[PDB]
Amino acid sequence: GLPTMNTPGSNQFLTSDDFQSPCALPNFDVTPPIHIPGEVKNMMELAEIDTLIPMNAVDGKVNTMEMYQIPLNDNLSKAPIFCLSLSPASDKRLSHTMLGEILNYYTHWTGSIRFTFLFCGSMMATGKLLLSYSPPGAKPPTNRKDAMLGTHIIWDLGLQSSCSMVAPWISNTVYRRCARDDFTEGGFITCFYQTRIVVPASTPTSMFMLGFVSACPDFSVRLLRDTPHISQSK
Amino acid sequence: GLPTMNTPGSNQFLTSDDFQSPCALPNFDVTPPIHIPGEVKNMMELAEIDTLIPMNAVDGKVNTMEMYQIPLNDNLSKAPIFCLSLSPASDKRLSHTMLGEILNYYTHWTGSIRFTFLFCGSMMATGKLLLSYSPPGAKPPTNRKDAMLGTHIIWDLGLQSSCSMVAPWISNTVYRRCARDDFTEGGFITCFYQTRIVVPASTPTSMFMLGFVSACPDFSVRLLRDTPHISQSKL
Amino acid sequence: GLPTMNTPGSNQFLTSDDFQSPCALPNFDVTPPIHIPGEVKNMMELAEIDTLIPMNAVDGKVNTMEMYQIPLNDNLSKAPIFCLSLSPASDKRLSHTMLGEILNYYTHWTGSIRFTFLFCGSMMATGKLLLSYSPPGAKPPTNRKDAMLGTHIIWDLGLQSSCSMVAPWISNTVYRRCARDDFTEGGFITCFYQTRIVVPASTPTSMFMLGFVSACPDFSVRLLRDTPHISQS
Amino acid sequence: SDRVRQITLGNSTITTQEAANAIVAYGEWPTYINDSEANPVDAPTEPDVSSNRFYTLESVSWKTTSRGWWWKLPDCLKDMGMFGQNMYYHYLGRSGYTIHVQCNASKFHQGALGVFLIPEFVMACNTESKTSYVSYINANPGERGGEFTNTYNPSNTDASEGRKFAALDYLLGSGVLAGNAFVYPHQIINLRTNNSATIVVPYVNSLVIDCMAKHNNWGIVILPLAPLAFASSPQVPITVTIAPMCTEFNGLRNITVPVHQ
Amino acid sequence: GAQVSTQKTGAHENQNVAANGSTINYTTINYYKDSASNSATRQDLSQDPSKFTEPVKDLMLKTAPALN
Amino acid sequence: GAQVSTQKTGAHENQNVAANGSTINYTTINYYKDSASNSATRQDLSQDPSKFTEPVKDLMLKTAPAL
Amino acid sequence: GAQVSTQKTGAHENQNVAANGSTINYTTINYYKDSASNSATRQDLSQDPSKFTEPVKDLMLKTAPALN
Amino acid sequence: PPSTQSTEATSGVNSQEVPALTAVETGASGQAIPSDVVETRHVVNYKTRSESCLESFFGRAACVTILSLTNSSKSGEEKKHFNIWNITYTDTVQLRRKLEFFTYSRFDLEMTFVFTENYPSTASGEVRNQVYQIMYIPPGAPRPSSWDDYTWQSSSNPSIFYMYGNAPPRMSIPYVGIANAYSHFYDGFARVPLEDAGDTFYGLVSINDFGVLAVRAVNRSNPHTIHTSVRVYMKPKHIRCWCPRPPRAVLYRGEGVDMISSAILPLAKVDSITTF
Amino acid sequence: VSQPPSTQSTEATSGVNSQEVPALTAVETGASGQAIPSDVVETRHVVNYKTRSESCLESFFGRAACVTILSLTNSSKSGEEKKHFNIWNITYTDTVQLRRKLEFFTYSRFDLEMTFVFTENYPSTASGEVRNQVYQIMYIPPGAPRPSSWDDYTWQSSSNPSIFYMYGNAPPRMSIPYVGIANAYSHFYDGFARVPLEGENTDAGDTFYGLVSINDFGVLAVRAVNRSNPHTIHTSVRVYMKPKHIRCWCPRPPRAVLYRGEGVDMISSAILPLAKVDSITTF
Ligand SMILES: CCCCCCCCCCCCCC(=O)O
Numbered sequence A: 001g002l003p004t005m006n007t008p009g010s011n012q013f014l015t016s017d018d019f020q021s022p023c024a025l026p027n028f029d030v031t032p033p034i035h036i037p038g039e040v041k042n043m044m045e046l047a048e049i050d051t052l053i054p055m056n057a058v059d060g061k062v063n064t065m066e067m068y069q070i071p072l073n074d075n076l077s078k079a080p081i082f083c084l085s086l087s088p089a090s091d092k093r094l095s096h097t098m099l100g101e102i103l104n105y106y107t108h109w110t111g112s113i114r115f116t117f118l119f120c121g122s123m124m125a126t127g128k129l130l131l132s133y134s135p136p137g138a139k140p141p142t143n144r145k146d147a148m149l150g151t152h153i154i155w156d157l158g159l160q161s162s163c164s165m166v167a168p169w170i171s172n173t174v175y176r177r178c179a180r181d182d183f184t185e186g187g188f189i190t191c192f193y194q195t196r197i198v199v200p201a202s203t204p205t206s207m208f209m210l211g212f213v214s215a216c217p218d219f220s221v222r223l224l225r226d227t228p229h230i231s232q233s234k
Numbered sequence B: 001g002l003p004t005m006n007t008p009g010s011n012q013f014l015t016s017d018d019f020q021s022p023c024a025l026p027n028f029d030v031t032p033p034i035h036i037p038g039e040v041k042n043m044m045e046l047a048e049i050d051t052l053i054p055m056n057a058v059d060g061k062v063n064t065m066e067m068y069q070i071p072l073n074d075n076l077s078k079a080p081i082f083c084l085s086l087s088p089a090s091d092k093r094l095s096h097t098m099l100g101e102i103l104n105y106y107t108h109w110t111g112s113i114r115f116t117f118l119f120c121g122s123m124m125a126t127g128k129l130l131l132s133y134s135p136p137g138a139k140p141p142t143n144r145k146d147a148m149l150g151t152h153i154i155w156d157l158g159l160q161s162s163c164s165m166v167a168p169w170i171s172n173t174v175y176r177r178c179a180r181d182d183f184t185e186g187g188f189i190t191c192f193y194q195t196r197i198v199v200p201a202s203t204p205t206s207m208f209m210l211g212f213v214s215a216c217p218d219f220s221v222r223l224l225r226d227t228p229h230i231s232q233s234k235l
Numbered sequence C: 001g002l003p004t005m006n007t008p009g010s011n012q013f014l015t016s017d018d019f020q021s022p023c024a025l026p027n028f029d030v031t032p033p034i035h036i037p038g039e040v041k042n043m044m045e046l047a048e049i050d051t052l053i054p055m056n057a058v059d060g061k062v063n064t065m066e067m068y069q070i071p072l073n074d075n076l077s078k079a080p081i082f083c084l085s086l087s088p089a090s091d092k093r094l095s096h097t098m099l100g101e102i103l104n105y106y107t108h109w110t111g112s113i114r115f116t117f118l119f120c121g122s123m124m125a126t127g128k129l130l131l132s133y134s135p136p137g138a139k140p141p142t143n144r145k146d147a148m149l150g151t152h153i154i155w156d157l158g159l160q161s162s163c164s165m166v167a168p169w170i171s172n173t174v175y176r177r178c179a180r181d182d183f184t185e186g187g188f189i190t191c192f193y194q195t196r197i198v199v200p201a202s203t204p205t206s207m208f209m210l211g212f213v214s215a216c217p218d219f220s221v222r223l224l225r226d227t228p229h230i231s232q233s
Numbered sequence D: 001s002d003r004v005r006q007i008t009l010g011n012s013t014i015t016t017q018e019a020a021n022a023i024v025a026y027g028e029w030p031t032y033i034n035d036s037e038a039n040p041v042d043a044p045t046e047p048d049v050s051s052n053r054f055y056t057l058e059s060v061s062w063k064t065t066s067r068g069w070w071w072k073l074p075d076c077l078k079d080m081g082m083f084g085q086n087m088y089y090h091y092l093g094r095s096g097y098t099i100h101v102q103c104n105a106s107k108f109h110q111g112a113l114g115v116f117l118i119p120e121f122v123m124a125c126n127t128e129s130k131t132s133y134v135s136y137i138n139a140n141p142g143e144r145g146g147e148f149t150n151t152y153n154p155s156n157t158d159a160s161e162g163r164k165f166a167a168l169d170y171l172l173g174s175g176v177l178a179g180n181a182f183v184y185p186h187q188i189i190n191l192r193t194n195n196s197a198t199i200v201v202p203y204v205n206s207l208v209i210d211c212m213a214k215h216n217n218w219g220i221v222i223l224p225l226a227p228l229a230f231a232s233s234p235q236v237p238i239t240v241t242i243a244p245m246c247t248e249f250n251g252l253r254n255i256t257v258p259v260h261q
Numbered sequence E, G: 001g002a003q004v005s006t007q008k009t010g011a012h013e014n015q016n017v018a019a020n021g022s023t024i025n026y027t028t029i030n031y032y033k034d035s036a037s038n039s040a041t042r043q044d045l046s047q048d049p050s051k052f053t054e055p056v057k058d059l060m061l062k063t064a065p066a067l068n
Numbered sequence F: 001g002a003q004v005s006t007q008k009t010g011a012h013e014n015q016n017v018a019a020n021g022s023t024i025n026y027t028t029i030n031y032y033k034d035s036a037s038n039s040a041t042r043q044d045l046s047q048d049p050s051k052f053t054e055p056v057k058d059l060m061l062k063t064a065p066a067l
Numbered sequence H: 001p002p003s004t005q006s007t008e009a010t011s012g013v014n015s016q017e018v019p020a021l022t023a024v025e026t027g028a029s030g031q032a033i034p035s036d037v038v039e040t041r042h043v044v045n046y047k048t049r050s051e052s053c054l055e056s057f058f059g060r061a062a063c064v065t066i067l068s069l070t071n072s073s074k075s076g077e078e079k080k081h082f083n084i085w086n087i088t089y090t091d092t093v094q095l096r097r098k099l100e101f102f103t104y105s106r107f108d109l110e111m112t113f114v115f116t117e118n119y120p121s122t123a124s125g126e127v128r129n130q131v132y133q134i135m136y137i138p139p140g141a142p143r144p145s146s147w148d149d150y151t152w153q154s155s156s157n158p159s160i161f162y163m164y165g166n167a168p169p170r171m172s173i174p175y176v177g178i179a180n181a182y183s184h185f186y187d188g189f190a191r192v193p194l195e196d197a198g199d200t201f202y203g204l205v206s207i208n209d210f211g212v213l214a215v216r217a218v219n220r221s222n223p224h225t226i227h228t229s230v231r232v233y234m235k236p237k238h239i240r241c242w243c244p245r246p247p248r249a250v251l252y253r254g255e256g257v258d259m260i261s262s263a264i265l266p267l268a269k270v271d272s273i274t275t276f
Numbered sequence I: 001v002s003q004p005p006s007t008q009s010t011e012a013t014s015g016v017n018s019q020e021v022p023a024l025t026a027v028e029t030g031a032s033g034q035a036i037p038s039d040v041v042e043t044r045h046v047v048n049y050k051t052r053s054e055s056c057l058e059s060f061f062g063r064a065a066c067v068t069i070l071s072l073t074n075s076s077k078s079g080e081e082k083k084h085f086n087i088w089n090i091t092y093t094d095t096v097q098l099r100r101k102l103e104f105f106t107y108s109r110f111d112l113e114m115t116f117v118f119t120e121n122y123p124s125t126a127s128g129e130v131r132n133q134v135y136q137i138m139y140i141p142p143g144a145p146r147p148s149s150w151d152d153y154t155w156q157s158s159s160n161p162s163i164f165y166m167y168g169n170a171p172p173r174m175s176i177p178y179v180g181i182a183n184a185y186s187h188f189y190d191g192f193a194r195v196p197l198e199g200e201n202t203d204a205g206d207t208f209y210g211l212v213s214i215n216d217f218g219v220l221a222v223r224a225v226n227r228s229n230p231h232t233i234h235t236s237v238r239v240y241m242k243p244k245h246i247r248c249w250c251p252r253p254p255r256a257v258l259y260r261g262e263g264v265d266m267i268s269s270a271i272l273p274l275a276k277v278d279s280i281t282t283f
């Protein structure tokens, strides 16, 4: 017998343990693989797919189809159209998007995030919308004039029906937590009218847009964790 | 001396284990081998041998020699002579055959199955039989007309009496279960007359046929399981 | 099924061992390093840093800022200004300096020790001091003559105010215990006036000097141990 | 010019004046099973033009109160044309599809329809006391398809209403939020810019070929994403036109005649 | 004095031998002087059913009438 | 029959180039006849998101008009 | 894929310069996927105390007047 | 290794061709990156997507099921010595949700067992080290009718034996399957009723039969009943998947895909759309 | 296979009458004088083969230390369910000897090993027989769901790592890679998690100044796995932790006073680190 010594760690079961083991079924003949369309290699390939954001998660809209419809008026308003926290894992509306759902299985995340908006109103409706992102640690952009002081685009409504802004990876930390913490503050995403939407006679005065979220190519995650969005009786 | 770690799975007894062990009788020289004819290397070599199908196990003809004898006659009929479910493992008659017995030690199987029929009539007997296989998932064969919407052989009785049909391997799956379930529908095999058996005066009017089943060369089985046909009193 | 034998020591936990251990988070991506300033490679790089000696830990001066101020006077005195026993990890005043504190984590040590003194007097004052080190096993210096007999240096007041003295590594053993020991002591450090401090008119007639201690380049330690300075209920 | 597309196969063509760029799910076109891999051994049936042509399903209207529509793909053509007949005669089959959805409106009609193609579209049972309980007839509605509900009301096994599927729109009939439906191949017929949209569907299974009478490889889901509105509820027509591609069958049986309502 | 050979394939393999490179190799060493102690042999897939299915003196041809 | 592969970078490892030193490698041997018994295989970091994010019959450039 | 390194000297070594031949060596093999699972690093005694004891912009020599 | 994407430095753009404008109606996702939207700096990016690989995602052994077995002195409890569970992954929601991201998958399975015991009764006394037999019974194989039947001979059936205090037992199971991948969904019936019917044959469950796991306390009964529990753990390895799906948003009901009428409300309210 | 470097050797040196004498300097410059004995006194040549191996940071921080002690009870009484498992914040704050060593540096980067020493005893005179138990140590990263009881669904640990250990076997052990967000862990944080803005409470920051508000690595959840027994058994885990592959930056003074709490805050009863000496001239 070859002299050996068992070190701490012997006879233990770790759920992430990666070692060899005997085959339950020696010489089993495994069914040949076939090509199946749709092969997935990484979860990030799904993180990069645009997901419709349940923005209008307000009383009477939460858990109905209308939660995905962002209203727009033809009427004058100086108010924001919407306001959203950036953190994709923490925010109540974003945590249920594909990006959020994937990130809910991770402890930390990094990289820029793409926000794409689609206008679904009348073709004859015209106007301009201001979409912007302000990094965290300053008064929220509740006034349009402050909303401009950050990353922003102006969206010309027209045949090129969609546009996008990417929230750049601006962070003091390399990665941010997926936890609802104060240190890794998300930042602010808002949209204001650049100008009122104007429509021709006999056109609806209530327009809607659909906002989508997806990961950018620079995006990644650190560590896998259990998600808090599913449960089971004892 | 050498630092090591005991991982899970250590010191367990697995019946499928393939680890080395000390010889209790070390340096015993083995009695020299001799050539013995009939060496078997694979169970499939036996699965491929034609075995009788216990097809007429009905009303007291069960568990008797007559159990393998399929009756035929010279009357007019548009009805089947016999019918088998294809499933070689779940059909009560196919299960109790050499193919079924080897097969019953497995959970999954695949490949074509050969059905061979031998007519044991008089030399003076003539006629033609329609033997067919109907893939699963549709109205069962019932009568002689619907039964032709599928694979078939027309067996012209003659000196080369025996003939065969192969129920081709048609499945959606790669493998089928040996276990009976609703999904793994085997399809059906039936046989009926093209024409009645015709004989001359003062000769037998009834005849028997012997059906055989065997694996085709493309046949295989996978996972081993205990066989349900074996039993014992509690020990 | 390779035959093996478990030797003594098997299935035990040694806090000072060095074995491999499987990662609980396989393929985890570790945050890339950056060039963070001030990298330390060894504790001895810190042992060589000069820190103040809380030499005047005497009644009314204990645990205060004045504890680091060594008084000087312009009057005639034949008395030592100060005395230390050279026991860097056990003396009440030395065990608390950076050198002592790093050293409080070690059982044994070697190498020479450097001391530096600084005059924080007026520019107007002049004079000279005697710094001296006396090896172990003899009456510790009681006066200036004893101080002159052993290793010493004269520190003049001047523009290059700081002066260092090195207590050379003189030892019977190769390494000394950090711990107070009747057998092993590091000898004695003292200071006497070489001459009276001369103070001009309208000039402070009393001063202070600061003293510092640090490891010399030939300094080392032998074995890590728990320190006595920190405790917990 | 991306705007005008002329799509053809067999003996039929659809021309759309305004359409979004076509999607090929997963970057793949349907093909015939290559000889490198097959389950069945019978020589195959390849109907060509008899099956590889466009068929039109009965249209529906887009009322402003609609919660969506759905179809099981091989089911919706089961009784239609020669494709239908061949599916009943053979045990196994494989086909891809061209799904082209049309919904025409003038510029003053707003709103949008998401068209999603879901492999294995599986819906929840309306009965709460039973799991995955649904009859063949309720599970397979035919060329008409079914509709989504805004609310779930188990019948507690009352008059087979419990066999019918639960079909919450916001949860896609499965307990999955609709906003993530976009993971599936999809296009949007946003009335303001596009009258139609086309998606190529490869055959998808764990198998190379399967029985179409038993398994629906794909379903079609159409949802308002944005409400229909016009300045009054216009009920804008929606038409779904489908063509099988690279159709093949294997194994001739008795014609299958499934239980009928 | 180790032996190295290929493994029966699994879920992530392309099912061709050596088409999976070194992924499918394994190492085995006999630790006993008595071969009875060895683990099971390499599967021997060679077979010849004619010993039992066509044990005939006059060679039969498939297309010939069996009873020539 | 042993394989040698590069280890995932740790806290005080080399530069992100992952090509510096022999101390960053590990050795592994398969001990079983059945490949299902092998420890997890190496990660495949190859990705192709366009399969699901841009499955368009007619390829488009980012700055091209979408319609 | 083992590495062989020398050992720190023990009582029996008459070569405190680590020069008594192959006699003093140890062999190490890493058995894990991540380097975090590896044993402690090789000792590295390179030091540079000037970083903390003489971080002076102006080069000073030990006999130079500290200030001229 | 392959790595994630870097950022190039950029400046102002007066292009007639703008990357920030698109049309999601085509089904394509927006493709713009920060360098297209704002002026950027060069950034070297080594933040590699390794934890997100499917091989890593599914690399943990989840608890799948709890078996309950009793070794008792009461004659009426002999039957409790014997516990048969169907092989399934649908018993625990965390694992099920992860697996249901993909329509089809292929993997080798690793199973690990954890055994525990306690006394179910106030009374106790000496109990000998217990040993357990886990026998696998493939579909259609005979099952024991009781705890010490002849079927426990397991001549063909895989079987593993474990004693308390020893290392948790385990085995590797090569991909087993009828198809070339496991299906997690089945929009179909086991049988087509022919010319209403088939109500009980819908869904994956009607075609799902991989065999069952039989656990038996090997020790004969002692005067003091001992209550044991077996926690069965599973992880995929060497895994590939062929079709992404959204994960389940609400609480599961049963093995198949179905819903609870009282639990269809996954989202919370915010005060307004303009409240962050 | 190179010989490691030694500490500084000594060259034989004669006495001198040099007009350039290293003894004097100006410590005011921030630089230490560099005299070695050969610069002060006559010295002999000394061959120096001594090294600084034990003072390498890797060696200094190379020992496992107890960092926390957790306890749990396996019992069967109506008020005991809550005691069956123990949830603990991951930190090194709990024990002073390790904390003090780490506090020598402002920043550090390392991998860790976790080792668990389990023990048990009877807290009750019943002294009855219990079976050998299995214990589970599950890690719950921040933001991950936590168990409400010992018997719950989160213990399924489908994504979270978890280790199962039997009492009586070798202490379980695992490696943890550096998991910091920053490029090093900070031992100190002179800042706030958030910035109270003009529209805030005057005292804002009182609930978050310091490292205490930014350092969050989740918790360990420890439970007996075994169902409860008629006879209560008290158990505990002595958690040991060791830095490995460790480098540090920006050295600072070691703590001189009794720690207390999570920050650097001292207590009034322990602000006097040195002993009194009767005289400046006492040896
Ligand atoms: C003694 C333990 C042997 C257990 C054999 C299990 C065979 C594998 C069946 C896996 C079924 C679930 C597949 C899936 O849908 O993802």
Ligand SMILES: CCCCCCCCCCCCCC(=O)O
Residues within 6 Å of the ligand: C024, I090, I091, I092, I112, I114, I137, I138, I139, I161, I162, I163, I176, I179, I185, I217
């Ligand atoms: C299954 C048990 C896994 C054990 C997880 C322990 C995680 C330790 C690293 C987190 C603490 C980093 C900051 C520190 O060094 O104190």
